[PDB]
Amino acid sequence: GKLVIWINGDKGYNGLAEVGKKFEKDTGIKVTVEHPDKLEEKFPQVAATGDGPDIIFWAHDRFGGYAQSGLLAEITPAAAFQDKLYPFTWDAVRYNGKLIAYPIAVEALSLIYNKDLLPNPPKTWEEIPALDKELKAKGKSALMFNLQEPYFTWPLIAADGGYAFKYAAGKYDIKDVGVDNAGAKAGLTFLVDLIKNKHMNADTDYSIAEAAFNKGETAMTINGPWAWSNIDTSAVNYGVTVLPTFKGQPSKPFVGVLSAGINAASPNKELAKEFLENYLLTDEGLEAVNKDKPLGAVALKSYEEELAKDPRIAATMENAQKGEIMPNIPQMSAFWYAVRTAVINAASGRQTVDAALAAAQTNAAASNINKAKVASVESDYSSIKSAALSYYSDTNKIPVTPDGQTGLNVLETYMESLPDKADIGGEYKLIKVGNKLVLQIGKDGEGVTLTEAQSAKLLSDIGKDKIYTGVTGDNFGEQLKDTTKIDNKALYIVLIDNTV
Numbered sequence: 001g002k003l004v005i006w007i008n009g010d011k012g013y014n015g016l017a018e019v020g021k022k023f024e025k026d027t028g029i030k031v032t033v034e035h036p037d038k039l040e041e042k043f044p045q046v047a048a049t050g051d052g053p054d055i056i057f058w059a060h061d062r063f064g065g066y067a068q069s070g071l072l073a074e075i076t077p078a079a080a081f082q083d084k085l086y087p088f089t090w091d092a093v094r095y096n097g098k099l100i101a102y103p104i105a106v107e108a109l110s111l112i113y114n115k116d117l118l119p120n121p122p123k124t125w126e127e128i129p130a131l132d133k134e135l136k137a138k139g140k141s142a143l144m145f146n147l148q149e150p151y152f153t154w155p156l157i158a159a160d161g162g163y164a165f166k167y168a169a170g171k172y173d174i175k176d177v178g179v180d181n182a183g184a185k186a187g188l189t190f191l192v193d194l195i196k197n198k199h200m201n202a203d204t205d206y207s208i209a210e211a212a213f214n215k216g217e218t219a220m221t222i223n224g225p226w227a228w229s230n231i232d233t234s235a236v237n238y239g240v241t242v243l244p245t246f247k248g249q250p251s252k253p254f255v256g257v258l259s260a261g262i263n264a265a266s267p268n269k270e271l272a273k274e275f276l277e278n279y280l281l282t283d284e285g286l287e288a289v290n291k292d293k294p295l296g297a298v299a300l301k302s303y304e305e306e307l308a309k310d311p312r313i314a315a316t317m318e319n320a321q322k323g324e325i326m327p328n329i330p331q332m333s334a335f336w337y338a339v340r341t342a343v344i345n346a347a348s349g350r351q352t353v354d355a356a357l358a359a360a361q362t363n364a365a366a367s368n369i370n371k372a373k374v375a376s377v378e379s380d381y382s383s384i385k386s387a388a389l390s391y392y393s394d395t396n397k398i399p400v401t402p403d404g405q406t407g408l409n410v411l412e413t414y415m416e417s418l419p420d421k422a423d424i425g426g427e428y429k430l431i432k433v434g435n436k437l438v439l440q441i442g443k444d445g446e447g448v449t450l451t452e453a454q455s456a457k458l459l460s461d462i463g464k465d466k467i468y469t470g471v472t473g474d475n476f477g478e479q480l481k482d483t484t485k486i487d488n489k490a491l492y493i494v495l496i497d498n499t500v
């Protein structure tokens with residue numbers, strides 16, 4: 001018997017491992033705590049039937065996907081243990097009538113601010129620019145937070161009626177997506193403008209935002225309870241308060257319930273159930289984790305009764321109140337992928353706010369991310385093909401990317417938006433292969449990635465004798481099949497069969 005545990009790297013994995021040590025001491029079973037980057041993505045991908053944990057910790061939104069893919073063991077705690085946790089926390093880990101994980105703690109973002117630099121934190125996003133201009137004169141800045149992750153930007157962007165999927169009594173409608181709207185356009189636009197007006201950098205991420213606030217260089221940050229530990233160790237006298245409003249609308253953070261599920265592939269399901277019920281989810285167990293990095297509002301009633309007295313904890317639940325506990329359906333991964341792409345695309349200037357959000361609304365509504373990427377590539381393909389034929393028609397010349405270069409700058413004056421790279425991976429390029437104009441996607445080592453399912457859909461939607469997986473001079477290699485998978489390789493789609 002053994003237990004490998006996964007938890008994210010911003011959580012108290014050191015404390016959790018202490019708890020691990022106790023369980024080992026009493027049972028002789030080794031507990032290993034790991035914190036691999038992007039664990040919530042690696043888990044269905046390892047899967048987790050290989051180099052995967054017996055127990056996985058994440059916010060509950062990821063778990064419906066897991067359950068649906070059959071990766072999770074059904075948990076069956078007795079009524080007496082269920083009694084120990086707040087009813088609403090079990091609802092976060094209910095999926096299709098079954099319990100599929102143990103709830104641990106309630107996570108909501110708050111505004112964290114420096115009382116010395118900013119004794120009165122702004123109520124509204126709208127005052128951040130002026131606040132920044134003034135702090136800049138002091139060698140400081142107003143706000144830094146992790147821009148790269150939509151978790152952090154969603155509260156602003158969804159403030160005015162935003163949502164992932166509609167909960168019509170009594171179910172989520174997976175084609176009814178609430179990313180795009182007037183509040184989101186205005187919200188996302190505000191972040192882009194902060195960037196353009198040098199009140200924020202497009203590249204600011206978790207580590208950068210955190211180091212800057214804890215070193216007293218930025219007056220405000222946006223984070224969860226797990227971040228308080230490191231600020232305690234710093235010289236900063238910080239307050240934790242309500243997220244700013246925007247256009248009168250309160251921020252609507254998506255609220256996470258940190259949860260521990262059990263790997264369906266684990267031979268150690270029962271030791272895992274013992275570890276979680278009788279070591280972690282006790283006053284001692286959660287205390288050891290919380291001591292390391294604060295959990296937020298824990299699901300355990302007895303310990304939460306004490307934590308609820310913390311004003312930082314009250315601020316958290318105030319933010320959680322104004323927001324919404326995430327859905328846990330499989331389609332959330334597509335939702336987050338959608339918003340992630342949209343914000344980064346907008347913040348860097350790769351799309352307009354409107355185009356970025358129109359795309360997210362589309363991406364979000366797709367079955368899965370892989371399907372979404374293929375649909376996207378079809379759209380690029382369709383636009384480039386049209387443009388290449390329009391070009392060929394107006395100039396009497398076959399459009400081709402210049403030797404030793406990439407990009408479709410050629411049809412630059414023939415398209416609305418110029419596609420740069422495929423969402424399946426790989427920079428776009430126009431080449432000839434004999435008497436054919438061909439769209440090449442990527443290079444060997446910097447190309448596309450495809451599952452069989454993606455391949456099948458592409459072949460069906462684009463047609464036969466179009467898609468090839470290699471080229472030798474002026475002839476084609478193997479054509480794509482519905483069974484082929486591709487790992488980081490170039491791809492080729494004919495645009496014109498006949499350039500006679």
Ligand SMILES: OC[C@H]1O[C@H](O[C@H]2[C@H](O)[C@@H](O)[C@@H](O)O[C@@H]2CO)[C@H](O)[C@@H](O)[C@@H]1O
Binds near residue numbers: 149256
């Ligand atoms: O940004 C998308 C991301 O949001 C949430 O992830 C949170 C997590 O819940 C927090 O505990 C903390 O680790 O920050 C993460 C954001 O970096 C969702 O749970 C996750 O599924 C989603 O991809």
